[PDB]
């Protein structure tokens, strides 16, 4: 009991740790390594405790010390079962769920990928301290690539991996009707978002018949001013000049700039 006490204040705070370690004085050796700020020392203690202590005992010691916990966590990411065990026993369910999501991104098929997402959702259930969003998100993710798989089977093009917005964009650009509206409806994409995507897609498609058809209605959730600007560049100044004066909320001084840049001097 005495031999441990005398080392607690001298000398080089880096050679007291191997001495503490041989005396089976763990934690104290780890605390001294942490307070030294020496990464090399912290690893040496962790690697020693990893091989000597049971994983359970190893976790407890390491979990109490955020710096030591970080290194074990860092070493495993570059091990997977170790990460899950660490997070579960420390009740870190969001971190554990992230491991399964990270595994889903590595699955060669969406079937196996969605199975990994399901495992992530399982972790977030129980206790569930405000995990409603993540559970719905993993639900959408499983929903999305399942629909995108149908598109690849039918349209013989690539869709799996794109976001909801990117999926809508590619669908509209290829002129695939309400298939994009089906995606939009299923994922509850806001009106202002969906119309920006549709505007950008039709412009990049130069589908000025559809744009003119869209101009043939009254209200616009994003306004008609975006329609003016988007069509003017890389497109018709003539079709752009259609949206004026539908642009409700305007300058109001004056209107000239729009009629001016549309070639009509």
């Amino acid at each position: 009991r005495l031999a441990t006490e005398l080392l607690n204040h001298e000398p080089r705070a880096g050679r007291q740790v191997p001495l503490l370690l041989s005396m089976e004085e763990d934690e104290l050796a780890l605390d001294k390594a942490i307070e030294s700020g020496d990464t090399d020392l912290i690893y040496f203690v962790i690697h020693q405790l990893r091989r000597k202590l049971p994983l359970a005992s190893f976790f407890r010691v390491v979990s109490s010390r955020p710096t030591a916990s970080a290194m074990v966590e860092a070493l495993a990411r570059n091990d997977t079962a170790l990460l899950k065990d660490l997070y579960y026993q420390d009740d870190r369910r969001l971190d554990g769920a992230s491991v399964f999501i990270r595994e889903a991104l590595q699955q060669p098929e969406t079937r196996t990928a969605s199975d990994k997402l399901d495992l992530a959702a399982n972790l977030l259930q129980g206790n569930q301290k405000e995990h409603v969003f993540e559970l719905g998100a993993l639900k959408e993710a499983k929903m999305l690539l399942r629909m995108q798989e149908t598109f690849e089977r039918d349209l013989t093009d690539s869709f799996v991996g794109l976001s909801v917005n990117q999926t809508m964009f590619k669908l509209i650009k290829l002129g695939y009707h309400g298939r994009a509206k089906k995606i939009q409806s299923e994922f509850k994409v806001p009106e202002r978002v969906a119309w920006w995507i549709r505007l950008q897609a039709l412009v990049a498609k130069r589908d000025w018949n559809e744009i003119e058809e869209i101009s043939r209605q009254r209200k616009s959730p994003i306004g008609w001013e975006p329609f003016f600007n988007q069509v003017l560049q890389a497109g018709n100044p003539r079709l752009a000049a259609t949206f004026i004066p539908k642009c409700t909320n305007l300058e109001p001084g004056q209107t000239i700039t729009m009629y001016e840049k549309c070639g009509m001097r």
């Binding site: 992230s98 990270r102 993993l138 959408e140 994922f187 994409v189 978002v193």
Partner: peptide, 21 residues
């Protein structure tokens, strides 16, 4: 918050559930 997080996910990928975390 959830409205912001939803925009990111369905706008860039549900993979960014890790990014937000």
């Amino acid at each position: 918050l959830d409205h912001f997080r939803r925009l990111v996910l369905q706008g860039y990928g549900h993979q960014h559930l890790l990014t937000l975390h």
